[PDB]
Design a protein around this ligand. Structure first.
Ligand SMILES: *[C@@H]1O[C@H](CO)[C@@H](O[C@@H]2O[C@H](CO)[C@@H](O)[C@H](O)[C@H]2NC(C)=O)[C@H](O)[C@H]1NC(C)=O
Ligand SMILES: *[C@@H]1O[C@H](CO)[C@@H](O[C@@H]2O[C@H](CO)[C@@H](O)[C@H](O)[C@H]2NC(C)=O)[C@H](O)[C@H]1NC(C)=O
Ligand SMILES: *[C@@H]1O[C@H](CO)[C@@H](O[C@@H]2O[C@H](CO)[C@@H](O)[C@H](O)[C@H]2NC(C)=O)[C@H](O)[C@H]1NC(C)=O
Ligand SMILES: *[C@@H]1O[C@H](CO)[C@@H](O)[C@H](O)[C@H]1NC(C)=O
Ligand SMILES: *[C@@H]1O[C@H](CO)[C@@H](O)[C@H](O)[C@H]1NC(C)=O
Ligand SMILES: *[C@@H]1O[C@H](CO)[C@@H](O)[C@H](O)[C@H]1NC(C)=O
Ligand SMILES: *[C@@H]1O[C@H](CO)[C@@H](O)[C@H](O)[C@H]1NC(C)=O
Ligand code: MET
Lengths: 50, 508, 149, 100
């Protein structure tokens, strides 16, 4: 639980190809600012459907 | 013993110049020395009046000895000049050779002080101001004329009258080095890199003492550690009373010098080893730093023993990021046999290991007063050996005092000594040192060792010493005078002649 | 920035937790506040939350940059941060007990200090006193003889 | 607190402007952060705006007190601030070149 944002932004760079414009330490939760993760919804249904 | 011994040791590895030296000592340094003491006391004359009484066509020795004792003293005094120039630069709390000076644009050090040690930009550019080649000689460099004048003035102020004025200076300046040397030994053996140098001194590279070069060097050094064939000891042993036990003195002197010859090698290598192990730790720390700065490891995980495994533990994790760092290479037994030469052994090694100890503005002054009062005596004897045969030649009208002749010799040698104070000055000194210390000494020694036992008769000399001291000499002296000494000499001679051709003549 | 604690302190080396990062960010904010008051005569209230830090590592290294107080899109150019640090480096060192070779700033290298020691070239007066004593010895000993004759 | 710059530094004594007050408040916040981690094992984020300062004077003296991070009515008792300072005094001295 002390690498959450490290891994979030590593994955973002490596597989999406998107870099953050300001460095974000471990006091943030950038994924939790999404409607689906803050309201407890499964997200894989948008992949398989496509 | 401090300025030519360790260099002539390191060039020949370091272990192959202690067995031949001692064999040649016990076989040639003692018997010839006893012989020349005994003659000096029997014939009752100086270094020239003797070889002019034995078959008078042999007066040449009285001139070869004088000429060679002049050629040696020509530069054995400018060495004292450099030493006292160093001695003057002490008496300041930050030692001048401990930092690099900045250029006109105060951003970094001067070039050659950065690419080399900070102490080499005090000996090669501020003291001497060496030029690139021997064929290139420039100004006169006044700030060494000052030291030359001071050296040739101290000498003339001490030997104004031969004996009756070297007495007191011998009382003082022949006991001082034997306590400062012990003070430096006690400090040397407790350093960090001791027992790593003095063990390097005694490991003989067996396939090295089978070369004529090392034998020739030991042979030419055992006659220069003493002062045989200089014509100085004949005259000194031509003053005391007749019924004096000429043997005892000879033997004790022979065993008080050959002992202080391995007692100075120990102290010098106890500092060379320290400097080498210091540079080795510095290289290793630099490698460790270049690794961690490159891979971001914690501080105390790469230490001197798990280094190789930790270096293997990174190359298997970042193969493209690893093959860019320029690593060094450094192993001991390769930092010991480095570029160390005379005129640069007691000024480049001892002066950088003297600034890494507390209260250095005291250790430096002690060391250089030791060197000065160790080198002054020798010049006392040499000046006696050049002054005695001159007035025994009727060259000056006998009505003039002795002070005038000593002063004339001093002035003449000083005025000739302008050749070493030029820019390209260290090269002339290296050349004269090498050749005038190597070749004429052993030929004069052999010629006299032959003349005494085969032109004066050995039996006459035998019963002569018998009447003098009170007993025929033991069989040892007989066998070492009659066959072994001249035979060894011939060998050394031929080796010198076989070590001159087929060896290129190069200087640095 | 690259920090080396075991080299300088050797022992007594404190541990670099997060409160040290707090103190470091505050020191940099102070240095910036000082520079924009003694050069440009502004009065800007940098805080420790205007000093952004990235890529922390065990070796004790990282990167940082500075932004204007409440404007995330206003980065102070690097050639000004370098001057502010050049100006307050000696206090930033003291706050941590580091000594300018264990707190390197990687592109800011130190130079301050003049090498003008010698006023007199002290070897000259030592040569003078030795020359005086040697000449006085020479004359007294050449006059001893003429007195004894 | 009472500070005497001309005594210690004598010369080279910097001038005590407002940025020094900023640095002082940050040092006290650091000391408090250290004490509530190596004694009480909390993790409290004191900032320099939690260190309140009163009665500034030329002699370079003043009073201060500390409050919990976002609670203006929560004053740390004085007998704890005294211990936190006893613990980090040697670093607070060094940040200013003063000598106790
Ligand atoms: C021990 O002495 C031998 C000489 O007998 C050294 O061998 C020489 O090494 C040099 C290296 O620069 C070569 O150029 C020579 O050709 C070698 N000569 C012979 C006859 O082998 C040997 O290097 C010495 N030991 C060490 C460790 O250096
Ligand atoms: C935050 O900083 C940015 C620049 O770092 C400021 O943007 C400037 O805004 C003015 C007017 O909006 C423009 O004329 C400039 O071109 C902008 N700068 C750049 C680099 O584009 C912005 O004004 C700042 N925020 C505030 C509130 O002043
Ligand atoms: C701010 O601090 C005050 C005390 O300094 C806290 O007040 C306490 O509140 C609890 C519950 O409301 C009471 O049981 C205590 O008696 C209060 N303390 C005192 C001294 O009266 C207050 O809770 C703090 N603020 C927050 C948001 O927690
Ligand atoms: C130092 O600065 C001066 C003037 O700025 C310049 O002339 C000189 O070349 C500089 N030094 C070097 C080594 O370039
Ligand atoms: C050293 O020698 C050079 C000649 O290469 C000369 O130009 C220079 O002036 C000398 N040093 C000093 C201090 O005079
Ligand atoms: C150094 O760090 C590595 C990885 O953190 C660790 O495995 C190793 O044990 C450390 N060194 C020591 C002496 O423990
Ligand atoms: C590092 O590992 C590669 C194999 O991936 C190997 O080829 C290379 O020689 C290694 N380098 C060292 C210095 O061992
Ligand atoms: C004039 S002799 C030069 C030095 C002395 N003979 C020695 O061997 O140390």
């Amino acid at each position: 639980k002390d690498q959450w944002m490290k891994k979030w932004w590593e994955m973002k760079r490596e597989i999406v190809g998107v870099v953050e414009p300001v460095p974000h330490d471990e006091t943030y939760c950038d994924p939790a600012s999404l409607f689906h993760v803050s309201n407890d919804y499964s997200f894989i249904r948008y992949y398989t459907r496509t | 013993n401090v300025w030519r011994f360790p260099y002539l040791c390191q060039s020949h590895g370091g272990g192959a110049f202690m067995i031949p030296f001692l064999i040649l000592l016990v076989l040639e340094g003692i018997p010839l020395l006893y012989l020349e003491f005994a003659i000096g006391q029997r014939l009752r004359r100086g270094s020239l009046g003797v070889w002019s009484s034995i078959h008078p066509a042999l007066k040449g020795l009285g001139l070869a000895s004088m000429l060679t004792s002049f050629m040696v003293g020509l530069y054995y005094n400018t060495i004292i000049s450099w030493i006292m120039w160093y001695l003057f630069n002490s008496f300041q709390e930050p030692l001048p050779w401990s930092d690099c000076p900045l250029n006109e644009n105060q951003t970094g050090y001067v070039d050659e002080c950065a690419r080399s040690s900070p102490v080499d930009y005090f000996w090669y550019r501020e003291t001497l101001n060496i030029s690139t080649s021997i064929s290139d000689s420039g100004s006169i460099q006044w700030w060494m004329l000052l030291c030359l004048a001071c050296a040739w003035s101290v000498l003339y102020m001490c030997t104004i009258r031969g004996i009756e004025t070297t007495g007191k200076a011998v009382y003082i300046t022949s006991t001082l080095p034997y306590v400062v040397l012990t003070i430096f030994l006690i400090r040397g053996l407790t350093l960090k890199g001791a027992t790593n140098g003095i063990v390097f001194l005694f490991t003989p590279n067996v396939t090295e003492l089978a070369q004529p070069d090392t034998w020739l060097d030991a042979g030419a050094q055992v006659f220069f550690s003493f002062s045989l064939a200089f014509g100085g000891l004949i005259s000194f042993s031509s003053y005391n009373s007749v019924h004096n036990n000429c043997e005892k003195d000879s033997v004790i002197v022979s065993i008080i010098n050959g002992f202080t010859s391995v007692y100075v090698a120990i102290v010098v290598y106890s500092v060379i080893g320290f400097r080498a192990t210091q540079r080795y730790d510095d290289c290793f720390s630099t490698n460790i730093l270049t690794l961690i700065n490159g891979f971001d490891l914690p501080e105390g995980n790469v230490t001197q023993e798990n280094f190789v495994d930790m270096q293997q533990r990174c190359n298997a994790s970042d193969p493209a990021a690893y093959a860019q760092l320029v690593f060094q290479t450094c192993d001991i037994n390769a930092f010991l046999s480095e570029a160390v030469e005379g005129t640069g052994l007691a000024f480049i090694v001892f002066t950088e290991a003297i600034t890494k100890m507390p209260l250095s503005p005291l250790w430096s002054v002690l060391f250089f007063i030791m060197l000065f009062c160790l080198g002054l005596s020798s010049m006392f004897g040499n000046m006696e050996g050049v002054v005695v045969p001159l007035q025994d030649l009727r060259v000056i009208p006998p009505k003039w005092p002795k002070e005038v002749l000593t002063g004339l010799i001093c002035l003449g040698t000083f005025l000739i000594g302008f050749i070493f104070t030029l820019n390209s000055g260290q090269y002339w000194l290296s050349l004269l040192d090498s050749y005038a210390g190597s070749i004429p000494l052993l030929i004069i020694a052999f010629c006299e060792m032959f003349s005494v036992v085969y032109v004066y008769g050995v039996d006459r000399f035998n019963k002569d010493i018998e009447f003098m001291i009170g007993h025929k000499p033991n069989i040892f002296w007989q066998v070492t005078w009659r066959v072994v000494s001249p035979l060894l000499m011939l060998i050394i001679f031929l080796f010198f002649f076989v070590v001159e051709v087929s060896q290129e003549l190069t200087y640095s | 920035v690259r920090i080396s604690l075991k080299s300088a302190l050797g022992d007594k080396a404190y541990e670099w937790n997060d409160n040290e990062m707090y103190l470091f960010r505050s020191s940099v904010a102070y240095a910036m506040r000082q520079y924009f008051l003694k050069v440009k005569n502004q009065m800007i209230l940098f805080g420790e939350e205007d000093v952004r830090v990235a890529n922390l590592k065990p070796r004790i290294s990282f990167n940082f940059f500075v932004t204007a107080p409440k404007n995330v899109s206003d980065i102070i150019p690097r050639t000004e941060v370098e001057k502010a640090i050049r100006m307050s480096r000696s206090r930033i060192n003291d706050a941590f007990r580091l000594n300018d070779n264990s707190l390197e700033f990687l592109g800011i290298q130190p130079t301050l200090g003049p090498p003008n020691q010698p006023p007199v070239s002290i070897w000259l007066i030592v040569f003078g006193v030795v020359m005086g004593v040697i000449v006085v010895g020479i004359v007294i000993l050449i006059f001893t003889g003429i007195r004894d004759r």
